[PDB]
């Protein structure tokens, strides 16, 4: 809504470090939100633009922020394979066992695609391997429908 949040949002998805830090210097709202509820954290995680995500939460950006449906930057980094950002958002206090309206955690989004590195990173930090979405699906049933044997071995 403000002229600083809009610039932050136009710059985060664009991948511009100097401009984002300059916007934050003049007092820009890091927890600004797009019309759908996506902050510069959401965009930096969706497009994998680190050097921005490390730069935002260093200035008080809410890592566990949720959009107008309940998704957090983890859901976006875990659904696309950004390990350098998953191991960072977790280090800065990101709820590994988050849940949106649909009940999907970053486990279901990392297993539906098969990012076993990130699945390891997430189970390292206490991701309930027996949680459920609203359909009654664990990461194990997802690994089985997709037919990935590696994940079947990971979850014992």
């Amino acid at each position: 809504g403000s002229d600083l949040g809009k610039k932050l949002l136009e710059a985060a998805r664009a991948g511009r470090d100097d401009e984002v830090r300059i916007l934050m210097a003049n007092g820009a709202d890091v927890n600004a939100a797009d019309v759908v509820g996506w902050t510069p954290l959401h965009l930096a995680a969706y497009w994998g633009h680190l050097e921005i995500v490390e730069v935002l939460l260093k200035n008080g950006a809410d890592v566990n922020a949720y959009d107008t449906l309940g998704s957090t930057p983890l859901h976006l980094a875990a659904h696309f394979g950004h390990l350098e950002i998953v191991e960072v958002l977790l280090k800065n206090g990101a709820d590994v066992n988050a849940k949106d309206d649909n009940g999907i955690t970053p486990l279901h989004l990392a297993a539906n695609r098969g990012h076993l590195e990130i699945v390891e990173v997430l189970l390292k930090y206490g991701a309930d391997v027996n949680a459920q979405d609203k359909f009654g699906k664990t990461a194990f049933d997802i690994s089985i429908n997709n037919g990935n044997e590696d994940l079947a071995e990971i979850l014992q």
């Binding site: 002229d3 809009k6 998805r13 996506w38 969706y46 497009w47 449906l69 309206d101 649909n102």
Partner: protein
Amino acid sequence: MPNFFIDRPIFAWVIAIIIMLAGGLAILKLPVAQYPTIAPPAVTISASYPGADAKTVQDTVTQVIEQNMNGIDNLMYMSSNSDSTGTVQITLTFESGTDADIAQVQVQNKLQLAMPLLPQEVQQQGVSVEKSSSSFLMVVGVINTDGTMTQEDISDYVAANMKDAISRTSGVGDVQLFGSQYAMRIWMNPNELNKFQLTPVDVITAIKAQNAQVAAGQLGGTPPVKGQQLNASIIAQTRLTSTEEFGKILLKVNQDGSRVLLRDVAKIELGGENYDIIAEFNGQPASGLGIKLATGANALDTAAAIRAELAKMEPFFPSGLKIVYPYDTTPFVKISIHEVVKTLVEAIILVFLVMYLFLQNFRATLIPTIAVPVVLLGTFAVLAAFGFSINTLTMFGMVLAIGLLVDDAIVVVENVERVMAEEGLPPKEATRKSMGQIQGALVGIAMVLSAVFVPMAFFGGSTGAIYRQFSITIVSAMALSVLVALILTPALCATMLKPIAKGDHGEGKKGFFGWFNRMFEKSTHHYTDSVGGILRSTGRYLVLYLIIVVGMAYLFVRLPSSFLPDEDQGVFMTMVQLPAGATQERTQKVLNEVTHYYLTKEKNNVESVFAVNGFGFAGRGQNTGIAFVSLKDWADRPGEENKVEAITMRATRAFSQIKDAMVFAFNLPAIVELGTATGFDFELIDQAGLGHEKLTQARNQLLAEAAKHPDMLTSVRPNGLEDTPQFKIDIDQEKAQALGVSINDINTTLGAAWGGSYVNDFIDRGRVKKVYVMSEAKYRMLPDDIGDWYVRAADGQMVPFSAFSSSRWEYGSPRLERYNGLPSMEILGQAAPGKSTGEAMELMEQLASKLPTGVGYDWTGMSYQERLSGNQAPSLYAISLIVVFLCLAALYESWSIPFSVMLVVPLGVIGALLAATFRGLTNDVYFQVGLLTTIGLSAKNAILIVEFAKDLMDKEGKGLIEATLDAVRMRLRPILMTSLAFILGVMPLVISTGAGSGAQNAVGTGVMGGMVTATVLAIFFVPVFFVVVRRRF
């Protein structure tokens, strides 16, 4: 030949008469258009899969029509653009000279065989192949003051009643519409279908069953029985005519005996097919239809017939309907062609009076006033026979030919007036003796000028279609000039002329004529002595030649290239582009601000505004918008501050303050269908199966690397759109069967609720109109109202969308563009103000070599033609120089003499290069044709000097220097007459402001600047070159 038309003058007349009648038979029948068809033909396959995204289209309609466009002749492109509104647009582009009709049938056919590959939802809406011109002769708008109507009522009254009436008009071509004609719309409320245990599928069936047309047959139908006396067609239930009847159709009837209807479930109205285009004429809700003219029709008569068909129907239609004309370009065509006719008649007048200043004889002045019109009318005849038309090109081709037409007349007149004075001969013998000096010179000049202009007609491209108009016109105008100079002009000089006394070089009696003759003889003696002194000393006046040539080459490289100037057509355009995810209300707020500006701050110049939301350029989304700004007549916009060159800058500076909106005001290019701005259409392609995301990465990378070279690249733009937020529903296939739901019912519900469904056709007032079934806006705006939509399982129980589906957000393209089947993204730009275009081309085809693996490039638009050309100008002008040298050796019977003529090219060129730099003009095409005209008349003035000299050295043996002096004395008089007459005829073209100023100036500045120098430098250097070349050989 000429000696034939001295004792046989009447014969000459009947030729002149004929080639006047042949001209008059054409000016009545010749079409009048602003510009001809220069662009390469192109046909646009347009389709609409409604309620869709860009990938659905790209993978169902675009990739299909693209694999089946095989076996098309003379093809260059297969461009394509798929949008999120469902509108797909595929653009083919065929070479120049290609027939558009044959191409269009080839496309229509290869598509009619690719139709049963598309879905059953595109066939209903259909695909519409049509030619691309984007050139609206005029737009017609329709307003309601009272405010009772909306867009959808004015549009229907326009379609059902007016579109046909103005399509029968003479020379009207295609007719496009803004808005949509009535379509009955069924807005559903899921909480009422949830009440009666219904879906938006039983509605589809109830409507497809109770609105169809059924066949029965006949009574007494053959084969009949013996004794039947009656046959009569049978008529079962047919289509529905009124909305009220649609409220009577039955969906179900409950066990309690209650009868369910549509009136109890839905809300039925008569609206529009697509609510995405919203037009406003000065805030008033409006509509309108665009008219583009046919091939071989006068724009002026066409517009006068449209304005008449519309007044013939002015009283019939209701109160609250006003017809207005925001966009009309014929008020500019009438001027632009009327301001060159008064130039030609002003030139014939100025040569009527110059020839009474120098010759001082009424009869000797009537001769060019008879020849020049004959030549112009025969030129119009030759244009007609070839199919050409009257344009700003075919007219500015005979304007800057008028010099070659007055020269071939006054050369003949003054030479016989000179012989009659220097030798006391009567007119007949003096003309039979003069034309013996010139009749070979004129033929050689004809060949030379034909060699100078004809190559311009082979330029090979779109620009070739302009150069061809110019070249045909001027070549015809000079071929007829030489003929009337060998056919009519001598017969006129032998009859209308009057004898005078020998030695009477011209004294005058009392007035300006005595002073004039006396000063002219004095200055002729001075010039003769000066040129003699020059001949005594060469080097100087031959080293100055290299100075002039080097300065000309220096000025020729500091002159920006261009195609055609932008001018004040009385109308301009404004573009609005909001951020991604912007709605109709925001864009309409912005367009209200724009209209408020144009109607509050510039109401002294602006007359109207036509704002269209959803009709933008490079996008049809909800985000874009456009405005067609119409201005008062040029008489009401005096000065230079009330022109578009200024209004555009003021509006842009003012709208730079509009926040959250990129607004751009711009004038109209001369060739709308063509590209301009010295730019280039670059485009990346993925030839390795990469996605759209990696291609976007590579594009953003190339851009970040293109701002690194601001020395030759200024504004490297992506013409497309950036990815935006989109909503993903991921159905669970298990829970759709466990609850006993059909997925083809789930998807039908979702689509017919949120996107629309063309169900059937109905009748309204004897016309076919469509039936759309959609959800009421209130229920299809945000997520979290999805769950308000129930689909019925097989068990009879109704389940919400919340039990099946999960939801998510995803950044994904609204616009996906292709190039030759392969994914692609377009890039615009323009070279820095000092650099050329080929340099920028080679740069960013060197920058592209550093892109990821699988990413290639290609050039389109005006950049595709510059690669299949570029070396044509030097080649063609070199063969032209060779033809000139040969045609001049054939004339002088010498291989050496021609150079004395071929060294006056850099004399008339530097003057124009100086004028175009002092007034700030570019290297337009008009400037080039002016350079060529100056070269032509400079060579025409020089060839006769050399002919006279070489003839005095053979017929008389006067000697080299004496002969040269006598020649420059003879030919001084006509040279000044020609130069002065053409300069006066062209001066208005330089003073001109307002209409056709950028063109009249572009022509006359160069013409005059080069003519001054080709006059005051060719009377000193050509004799120097003659004596030099004769000494050297």
